[PDB]
Nucleic acid binder design. Structure first.
Lengths: 152, 152
DNA sequence: GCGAAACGTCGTGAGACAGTTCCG
DNA sequence: CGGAACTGTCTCACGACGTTTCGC
């Protein structure tokens, strides 16, 4: 848990707004409370030849990894706790994704209760419909509704 | 000849590096001595759904304009004088496009004595080649070599 | 049972030029 | 005759999720 240089956040808030992404997801899983996994993700992608930029971030941010997928590379940050600490100091400098950052940031803060009640789960399980709304979704295939149908 | 707030440049440079582009071209024009216009363009592309961001930009930068290519839109800035003043103050903040920038500045500076000796001209066409090299060039024709049809 | 890397993919939403006017 | 406006689009470079894998 740390605080980063105001100027690093300012510039990174710019790069995240451009070629960046703040994803929320309801990954359906068995070994998991109600058959689904509550997953939160922060990523930045770029041409593999410019991979260094991403690798740099792994060093500066202090967490997360970088992966290869063809003619492109990605920086992945999903450690729910340091994710909360990161989306904490950067959420203000955002301009195009400030909305969908908070929700993510305001779901973790309630993730323990999640499991609890199905009408307590669905709750959170909605925000992750909002964010998905705010982004530019085009291949979504699992919503609160599909997990509404958790009727046994 | 306005100066900007650092918190605006630090962030815009981040953006620019993300969904931005710093072009330079040899538009073959029939008027013009050597029959080739040197053109420089600063621009930022975005889905017409978020053009209010491109507009505040026009207002924030104090110069330039927005266009409409249907689904996406751009913020265009070509006037040399303004272009030179903007690109001088953003330059120390860019990270993946900081060079390309400088070559544009350099060019601007030589633009005048650039159409003196046919050879002092090709030297700048080279400043240009260098630039498209730094970009993700994919559909370019007229180069410093294409121009070799002037020495004759 | 949880959270967490590790691995794959659709369909753009951006980017880096080319062309051809319009003033003055 | 130099310089922006208006205008046209080819080719990726992204953004945004999708099934796998599994020990702590």
């Amino acid at each position: 848990n740390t605080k980063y240089n105001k100027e690093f956040l300012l510039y990174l808030a710019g790069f995240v707004d451009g070629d960046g992404s703040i994803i929320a997801q309801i990954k359906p899983n068995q070994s998991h409370k109600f058959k689904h996994q509550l997953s939160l993700t922060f990523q930045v992608t770029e041409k593999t030849q410019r991979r260094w930029f991403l690798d740099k971030l792994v060093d500066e941010i202090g967490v997360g990894y970088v992966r290869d997928r063809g003619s492109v590379s990605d920086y992945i940050l999903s450690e729910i706790k340091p994710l909360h600490n990161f989306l904490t100091q950067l959420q203000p400098f955002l301009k195009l994704k400030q909305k969908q950052a908070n929700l993510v940031l305001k779901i973790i803060e309630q993730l323990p209760s999640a499991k609890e009640s199905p009408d307590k789960f669905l709750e959170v399980c909605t925000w992750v419909d909002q964010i998905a709304a705010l982004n530019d979704s085009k291949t979504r295939k699992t919503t609160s509704e599909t997990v509404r149908a958790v009727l046994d």
